[model samples]
Target: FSELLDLVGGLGRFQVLQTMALMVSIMWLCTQSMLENFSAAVPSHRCWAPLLDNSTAVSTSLSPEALLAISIPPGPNQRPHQCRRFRQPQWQLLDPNATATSWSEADTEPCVDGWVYDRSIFTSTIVAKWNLVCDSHALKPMAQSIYLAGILVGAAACGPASDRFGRRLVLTWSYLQMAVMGTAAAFAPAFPVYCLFRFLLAFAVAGVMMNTGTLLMEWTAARARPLVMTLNSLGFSFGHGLTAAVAYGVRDWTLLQLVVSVPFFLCFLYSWWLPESARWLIIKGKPDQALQELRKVARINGHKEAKNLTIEVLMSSVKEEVASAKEPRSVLDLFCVPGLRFRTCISTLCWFAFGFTFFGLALDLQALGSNIFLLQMFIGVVDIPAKMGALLLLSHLGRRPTLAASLLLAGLCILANTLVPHEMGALRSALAVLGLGGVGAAFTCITIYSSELFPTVLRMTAVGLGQMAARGGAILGPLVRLLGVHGPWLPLLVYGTVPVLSGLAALLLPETQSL
Candidate 1:
């Protein structure tokens, strides 16, 4: 199959156009993919102090400071508790000389009226709209989890669908579906409706994720595969970087959501421009379409043998390719085969940790403290160099060591972040960014490595399963942070340890680097 592409024009004008177009598509992917995190951002909030809101507490002749002193009790941070406030106003404690301990005499309760949100960053977000903080803060993570649940569902189904249909059709439909769901989510009348749309958006994402890389890989030469995959990584990172920039400008959740959804319409309209995989067409017994596409490729790429490339030639090549395979493969072959099974299991572990560590760090940007938008921007920019580093390592150390090293690096950075003292804000933020970079690079390696690991018979299925594992990890990533409610270190400890172990597991997989 690769030899046929090479004969037509391996790394030439047509392949270049396909790569560039797909890269543009991938940029949009990053935009919509990471939009949920920004939408679900939980800004600093406290129990709504309605008594201190406007006229009631101010009429008591007590200064605003005295009212706050008497209203909300100090938390462990020596600040007003974000979740609880005094059950009743303690007017007697309003004396200027009253110490912090005086508020302890009053009974406390959760915010019943409403919650006050710190909206300095986001003009609006899902968290603020729904009051998803405090006891309901778990819902903030649940929003992301539900979307990933949709991704898991899509991963399971999208692979088989793409194998049955063609890659171009599946990918195009996925984009349209995502655009509709994303736009719907922006206007969702209620939280449940928003979650429903989010789930649907992920369904589209799964199809795109399953087919897009495979399409690109099928079009390029083996030697150039690493570079091509790196470009895809950059495209995703470019979207990620743009996510922060757009979010920074819009600030409103609805507006930001609208901005991300608009591009998919363009992608859907342009979907016809994306060529189908010639290899797939031929393999599926569509020699007519394959011949047409190959002729197009030959003309665009200035193939000297353009006149000779025909349906007969393409069919012969397809026959030879099919003849090489001794047995027809099913999805079950992935597990039923030995070398393939080991590779699948290890890749699954690495991909799972890839989601667990990467998104865990990404979602926790708020915890790193500072301008979260700026932090998101920094994380996005760092991914470029991370992808570049992967390219270099992939060329030098091969896939096994490079992937293992990246996972270990991400894990170590996370572990080091756990040990850093809370007061060392500068150090911790730097470590968080480093951890994001390491895992971000590992994701690039994982994408290309996994694509190369399996043959076409079950390539999409294997990739889908790997992504299913990652989505499962992604579902858990946010929920893990819930442990911070118990102790800050627990989330960090788990995030750090798992990736390192996953990295160790990666070492056992067969190397496909130079193959």
Candidate 2:
């Protein structure tokens, strides 16, 4: 089918534009995935005691600091407690000039009143809007984990759907669903309702993601697939950058969500222009329709003799290609075959760590104690070079070494952060950016490498299974960040460890570059 498909346009102007447009659409899907970083942002918070308000207080003469000194006890860090307050004000503890240690301590209880948040960065987020702090703080990270879980659900189901139905049909409806569900997320009345919308939105994103990759690869020439795929990966990073820019301006999560999702309606409109995969059409016993689409490409690409790629030739090519390979009965067949099983295992592990390390550092940037906006933007900037480096390494050293080296370097950078003192934030932040870049490079390499590893019939199934593993690992990333409640370094330590071991797994796979 390569010959038949290429007869219309072989990496020509027509094909390149399609690849770029489709990849750009995939970029929007990525924005939806990473938006959780901004939407669920946790700002500095403390207990709210309405009684301390000067206008409402019974002790109207007490000043703000005097009331805090008497009404709230110092936490272990010697700061005013964030979630606890005195059951009754101890007015004797009020000495404005007294040091925190010299001041009298008081019996405390959890804040029955809500909380106050530091709105210096994010004006509003799901955490602030929903009061997901203190006893409910775990809910913030849990929401993100559920979002990733939704990605897993979408990926598992979309793979077979796109393969069975046409790619264009599935992708179009997916975008429509993403637009509708994502907008619905903005108006969600409560946390659980918002989570439901997020799950459905992710379901659509998975369909968009799978079909986009498959279509982009099918349209690209074999020689250009490496660079094209790398560009596709870069598009997601661009979306990440775009999210930071938009979020920086629109600090309200509801408004930010509306901004990101409303534009997908344009995609829903553009989907009408998208063509079904001609190769897939031929494979599914529809050569006449495949011939018509090829002829359309031929006319647009100025290929004069599209008539030569007739229905008969297209049908013969499909039959020969189908007969050449064994049919994969199920995704289980990937594991039943010994050689494929090992390759799948290693690739799946690499994909898992690739996603874990990349997003783990991304979501935790706030904890680095730096300017969140600048660092988020900086992380986006790093992705460009990482992708360029991936192109070079994939072309020169081969996929296995490039994959292993990138993952190893990323792990080391993350580990380096644990050794640095919290006061040296500039150093830690710098290392974290480098770690993001390293994983970005590894992510590009693994994507291209994995696509090349499987047989054509089983490719979508295999990719879907790997994506499931990736989302599973990503779910653990935020939950690991919660461990920082124990020690600031605990999350970084786990993030550092997983990728290094995953890099070792990369070495077991055969290099696809020279094959």
Candidate 3:
């Protein structure tokens, strides 16, 4: 009877949270993929030049300068495009003995070498191609680190701001920020300025992600949060592919940013009609505002009878509390609670790995290693079904195995990457499958566990902090690029490992399945 009633109550939960979740989830993914596409957007093949001309193979005894145009031509139907600038090197002036040179080793044996590229646009005569710009190596991984540092701050700021001020406000402001800053990124005067815009976008992007999740989770019934969160993960896949499709149409990074920014700007329309969070307002002691918002949600959801709503029984009392301290919940107090402690620790570690690998993949998309954008597009497609399946799986299977399986699946996919020979289409499909499980599982688990463990008094706080902990992974995501010479695989391996750990961590969490 209790379980049945719980399920029914979940079905009766707020509708506003549901709408917020779906919107933010989609927007978050769009922004994330936009950033990804930007990073991967390498210049076209005119830059590769005559030096990429084919000689079938080049000689070992040839001078570095002489070896410039040795083209080991691409396979059939495979339109060869720029992956790196080294394809146009002035080989005649180069040193064959250079150890630091790409693929140059102590042994003077000259293999048919190629330059890796960071993803970018190509300015070719006919159809301009997109590719990566620079090496994906973790060498001087600091630049990527800074980018994530901005993301961490972004995530931290937006979630709380939305919780306090209202999702509508955060969404509108963030959309505005993304509009101005993201456009500036494409035409920045210097690399530093370009990075500045990237950071600016990161701030807005993170803010949207944090607030969106809260809004959606709050709106849905308890049962729906897990399902919705998983779906949100799936939406991320579409965002990436959609951006790729849009990129196909626009074909210019600056233009692409401008085009995408338009929709984001349009998100501001929400501020006028969207209600403040009933959950948030109630928690803040603004019963009148909460009730007003509840009335709006009831009307939208077609539950006219729910207009008589009073949620003091649902959420805790806030009469004695002040909006000033945001409820005396120090960062340290999070650790003091037994339930909060476990959730915080495990969720943080899980997200750290997520930030590392997911962001690593984003940055590495344009690395000097491989055409990860081409690879990334493939990665994006698998997610559509991957996320929705989690809702299905969780409905029947419960949390433990589903969570563990997600980690195992993601890890195996990343590990399996090396086995793919890096030249096969089948390998690409397989990795995408694995990544779907990996990313999907992490995405699903964070939503479920973060909310379950925190009290209403600290719900937003716990969720934000847990999620903020995941931003630690974002820091590692780009920084991992500088790791040793596994090419881009070093970061891939590390990213794959984190989710597996997340699964293990989930094992220690008490399932709030009954709650």
Candidate 4:
């Protein structure tokens, strides 16, 4: 199969265009994945003062500050209580000599009326729009969890669909699905409806991600594989920074959602230009279509040998693959073969570790106490060097070592962060950024390494299983943070330890560099 690619001009003009187009499509992926950070951002808020809701002249005469001072009680951090309010207007609080004892003795109750949100940064967010604060705060994380669940379900469903249908067909359908679902989410009239649309959007996103990756790997020649994979990962990093920029400009959550989704319509339009994987074609016994696509590539690359290529020659080139294609293949085959089972286990572990640590750090950005946009950009910027380093090591040191080293590095950085005191915010943030870079590099390495490890017939299925493990990790990553109540360092310890162990486990897998 690789020989056939070389004959048609490996990594030539056609491959470049295809890779670039897919890269552009994936750049928007981060925006969808991380959109909740801004769309659901919870700004400073307090119990809404019901006393001021009336249109009476007495209530209208009171200043806003005086109104809140009487209606809401003081809480920690010198801010008004988020969930509580004075049972009655405490005008005594305004007196200069009011004793602390009196304030503590005042009656309080939950904010039954509603909440007032500080929207200086975000004109609106799901948190503010739906009043998902105080008692309803759990719903915010719940929505995100549902989105991740969609990714998991999508991986489970789309992987087999891609293998059964074809990469181009699945990818094209996913693009349209993403466009429609994402746009629908922006206009969702109710929170439940919004969550439903977001789930579908994530489902479509998983399809696009898996298929695009498989297509890139199947189409590229061996020598160009590493660089191409690194570039694809880089696109994800760029999208992270791009998300911040877009969110910063579009403060309204609905508009931001709309802005991020509209481009997929364009992506759907261009996805038609992409060719089906020729390797998948021959394996599926569609030599005629495969031959047509290959000759098109050869022609696009100006290969004079294109004329000599025939359907018979194409079928003969991957005769072994075609012969094996006759046997039934399913997810069970991944573990039925001993060697493949071992590789699959290690690959799944590596993916899980990366997902757990990466998302554990990525989603917990508020602890850094920095501007969200700047922090997002910093995280995105650091990936450039990390992925570049991964690329260099992958080409020279081989995929196994690069994979192990990146994960170990990330784990070490995360572990180091546990030792830093909370007051040392600067050092903690630095370690986190560095740790994320390691995770990012490991992510890049595993994407390519796993694709290379699996056979073309079951490549999407293998990657899908790996992704399911990743989504599982991502889903648990935040839940693990609940351990913070026991000890702040507890979650960090878990996050740091798993990746290091997984990195060690990664050593048992065979190297797949330039194979």
Candidate 5:
């Protein structure tokens, strides 16, 4: 009883101390890696692919098996004598000093696709230069879907870790490891390498998201934890804003890849400097270490260090279940409550809408207008106002109404293109204002509303899953463009409608003025 009392200290200092570390680490990871690493992941130059002999082969209408027999050794660095056989498939490389010369299919040996390093190299540097292909634009939405999947997987890992191994251990191992994997992704050569690293990154990203809020609220003074969590959303938006500038500067995709990843240095700093979650550490039967970590954590927060303190064992009913009863909810327990049920519906629905249209629209900007780079940069630039406005006005205007208005605006903008006649170039430019502005707000509201809807226990899973739901929408957003279904207005129409639906759902939830 007394141990429980001590663990649940008068102020819940242990939780805050633990959460600060997670918050800082997560901020660095999401801001630095998730936002920036994909710059080079796509095939940046597509037009050049045809210049290689393979395009002529593809034009021959040879069977897939026949087509695979001959591709060139791409890049400026392949061995010269090794180029004779059709057996070895490689991406075609051009001599930098020599002007590109067209090759007939008969001039080259047969080669096949399905090779990793060979394919992406062919996709990026070769076809793009000759054909003016921007594979990155095609790959971005697909990558976003992959990213959302990773987020969901990460969230699943978190719940189990928090229950059994202890939140701190799960966090330390899983979350920190994800940051390392994210750093690794910047250097992935093959498309397979990129996907592999992305999956690993997702595993930890989920944990950090879920545990950051849950662990903190468990040990923090209730009054301050809510505010602390708000900063978390701030961290994410800041990541979004920062990515635009980093991406714009690192014009070459591969170089841009490295920029987002270098911040894992912050996670390494975390290993020594940041405190473990004292609340989690205590629950797992390491009270002495918890107290020691707690003291340093207080110091990190600039609180006075602990004075003379005696260690004593106290009994409590909440046994050491960290290792044994890792599983908390039974099958029936997961969706048994009505309130939880409602939250599940509202949040899951919104997650789908948010991930799909919001990300879909933002990513699709490269295709929508003449200045793809400028448009992407501008879209990201707009996020700052929405982010700032949310922080400043979130309290007064409230989550539901703000979200509702944002959604309403987004949908109307999608419909706005209908009002502009094809001949009205001036009106099209004006619509950009309403359309981009809507996209920015829908995105910002998504992070905020989704987080608020979930209870502490299910926060990240709920939110991350919601993110996954959004991924499906993102997938459709691209197909809409590829098929020419939505025109510029198609994605806007989808984005506007989904978010408005989500906004209506938000109105049903209980207001969260207090945690």
Candidate 6:
């Protein structure tokens, strides 16, 4: 397949056009994956005191500030209590000389009405629109977890489908599914409806991700694979930055969802123009179709020798693969082969730990104690140097060393945060950025390395399983963060340790550099 791709011009006009198209989808995928950060942002809020309502005669006499001062008790950070209000107006406590003794004596009760959100940063979000505060606050993270679960299911389901049905068909369907489901989520009437749509959207996203990788790998030559994969990873990073800008501009969550989604309709349209993987066709015993596709690629790449190419010549080149393809493959095959099983176990572990730490840090960007938009942009920008460094190391040090080093570095950076005091917000944020960058590089390496590790017959299935494991880790990430209620160090300890252990396991995998 590599030789065949080289014959048609490996990094030529055809590959470039296809790669650019895939990059666009990848960027959009990044936007969708990280959308929750802005869409569900929890802004500062306080209980709405019904005593200040205009229906009451006293409301007209009292100034808004005075009414608020009398009706709402001050809480932590000098803000009104988020879930509590004065049982009765404490007008005397408003005096400048009011002492703590007087404030403590005022009766308080849970909010009878809803809450008032500060929309200075985000005009609207799931937290604000649905009033997911205090008692319902747990729902916000649950929504994200549900979405990640969908990714896990989608990976497991779509991986084998892509291998059996072909990459282009599955990718085109995923694009359409993403567009429709994402748009539906935008107009969802209730929080549960929104969660359902988001879950479906994530499923399509997994299909897009898994198929895109397989298609890119099958089309490009081995020599150019690393560069192309890195470029795709860079597109994802760029998308992260673009998401912040888009969210910043469209403060309303519904509009932001629509903005990110509607573009996929165009993707679905253009996806039809993309050729199916010729290598996949050849493997699946469709030599005639594969020849035609290859000829088209050759012609577009300006290779006149395309006319001279014949089925007999094509069949002779990949006869070994064709023979092996006769036996139907399934996900179970991953464990049936001794050598394959060992590699699968190690890679799966690495992918899980990678997802665990990566999303554990990523999903909680607000915890870094900076402007969410700037934090996202910083996280995005940090990827450039990290991925570029990865590219250099991947080319020289080989994939195994680069993968191990990146994971280990990320683990250590995360672990370092446990020792930093909570008051040192800047230091913690900086360490997180470094850790994210390390994980970003690991992501770049693993995508290319894993594709190279598996055979074409079972590539999608294996990659899909890896993705499933990763999503499993991602779903657990935020839930683990909830353990912080016990101690601030607990979640950090789990997040930091797993990746380091996985890094050591990564060394057990066979090197696939230049193979």
Our tally of clashes for model 6 stands at 0
Q: lDDT tens string, model 4, 271-361?
A: 7877888888888888878878888888889889867877877878789876876777667878887768888899999999988887777
Scored by TM-score, the top model is 2
Which residue pairs does candidate 4 place in steric collision? none
Runs with alpha carbons beyond 4 Å of true place in candidate 3 = 1-34, 42-121, 124-144, 282-292, 301-327, 337-344, 362-377, 453-460, 484-489, 501-505, 508-515
lDDT by residue for model 3 (1-515), tens:
12212422444434435554455548444655445435334343323333334446443676533454333222123543233223334343345554333432232221224343323443221112211233422222454576668878887676557656777678778878877886686666555676677788878877777666666665566655666666666677766666656656665556665677666656666555666655556666677776666656555555655544455543443443444345577568778986567667776676666665666665444432255445556556666666667667765666666666776677667767655666675656556555754675557765665666667677756666666766776676665555644455665666666666666776776566653
Instruction: Estimate, for each residue in 1-119, the C-alpha lDDT of model 2 and write its tens digit.
Output: 57765666678877777877877786777677778778887787777776664455465676677777777787776688888887776666765555556443445678777788888
lDDT of 5: 0.54
TM-score of each: 0.92, 0.93, 0.72, 0.89, 0.66, 0.90
Q: Model 1: runs farther than 4 Å from truth?
A: 56-62, 96-106, 303-306, 321-344, 450-464, 508-515
Better candidate by lDDT, 4 or 6: 6
Candidate number achieving the greatest lDDT relative to the actual structure: 6
Clashing pairs in 2: none
Q: Provide C-alpha RMSD values for all models, in order.
A: 2.7, 2.5, 7.8, 3.2, 10.3, 3.1
Residue pairs with backbone overlap in model 1: none
Report residue 153 deviation for candidate 1 (angstroms).
1.0
TM-score, ranked from best to worst: 2, 1, 6, 4, 3, 5
Write model 1 residue lDDT over 1-515, tens digit each, in one string.
56687788779988788788888878887888788668877777777676687564437676778778767887887677888888887776766666666555448888888887888877899989988877787887777778778888987788678878889999989989988998999988899999899889989988887687788888888878778878878887787778888887898899889888988888898878767888778888888788777777787887777667667767786787667654766567689987677788888898899988877777657777566777778887887888897888787788888888988998998899889998888888888888888998889888878877898777866876787788889888888887888888888899999999999898777787665
| lDDT, model 5, position 278 | 55
> Against the hidden true structure, what lDDT does model 1 obtain?
0.81
Error of 4 at 173 (Å): 1.1
Which pairs clash inside model 6? none
How do these models rank on lDDT, best leading?
Answer: 6, 4, 1, 2, 3, 5
lDDT: the better of candidates 2 and 6: 6
